[PDB]
Design a protein around this ligand. Structure first.
Ligand code: A1D90
Ligand code: A1D90
Lengths: 121, 125
């Protein structure tokens, strides 16, 4: 892969939960886009179950004709940070979900995945 | 300022709506965190009222010990794009709101301000 962020999305796209989980450092956090904190902090032990959930949601939206698009990661001037823009589109192209992840890396592992999404409210 | 992004947050914090507005290109869009799009698109003519609404929003949080923090922009490898992380916090430090802006700049003006915020919830399902 071109980077550990590329590896994470490539594993996910493959359904390799274990491969994606291994992209995270043992002290990593996933800062979810919704929750009381605001957002929600998931530690590495808690992340694997999130990846299982996401794999089954991915297959369910695909069966409805939806298309999940993850843009190529763009690194910041700080090379240990990068953003990944993403969206969910109906089959014709309409966007129903859109967000961005801010990654923090350390020593080739993901240390923070900070997830944001538009509120279609 | 050290960039038009620095200028924008300097002028907004002063309540200088006109100065903050002038940071936007005439064809700029402010993509708000919430709406049906998802998010909500504001063109430059609609941004000024948003800036006034936000200006009286700031007074009401200011008038309650709440402080907003806007981090220095960090640019992408595309030097016309940058992220600004931000947070609103109570006096005692509790985080009330937190988000990130993705800026697209062009010819020294803001072309896109793409706003994302964490959703404060007990749970999503
Ligand atoms: C199980 C709940 C966990 C999600 C949240 O509620 C918030 C969060 O921070 O984490 C998750 C949200 C998240 O990460 C993304 C990228 C969602 C995007 C969607 O993901 C799909 C299902 C593909 C993944 O396989 C297609 C679509 C673009
Ligand atoms: C930065 C505004 C971007 C907002 C939108 O795109 C519309 C929306 O739905 O959500 C976004 C986020 C939002 O609304 C708030 C309230 C952000 C913080 C607040 O900004 C103040 C007014 C200072 C800026 O001058 C003080 C306070 C910390």
């Amino acid at each position: 892969a071109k980077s550990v962020i590329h590896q994470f999305f490539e594993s996910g796209a493959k359904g390799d939960v274990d491969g994606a989980w291994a992209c995270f450092a043992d002290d990593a956090v996933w800062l979810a886009s919704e929750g009381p904190e605001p957002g929600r902090t998931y530690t590495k032990t808690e992340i694997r179950d999130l990846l299982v959930q996401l794999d089954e949601m991915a297959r369910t939206v695909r069966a409805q004709g939806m298309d999940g698009v993850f843009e190529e990661p763009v690194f910041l001037t700080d090379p240990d940070k990068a953003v990944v823009e993403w969206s969910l589109r109906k089959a014709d192209g309409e966007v129903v979900d859109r967000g961005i992840d801010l990654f923090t890396l350390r020593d080739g592992k993901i240390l923070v995945k900070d997830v944001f999404r538009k509120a279609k409210l």
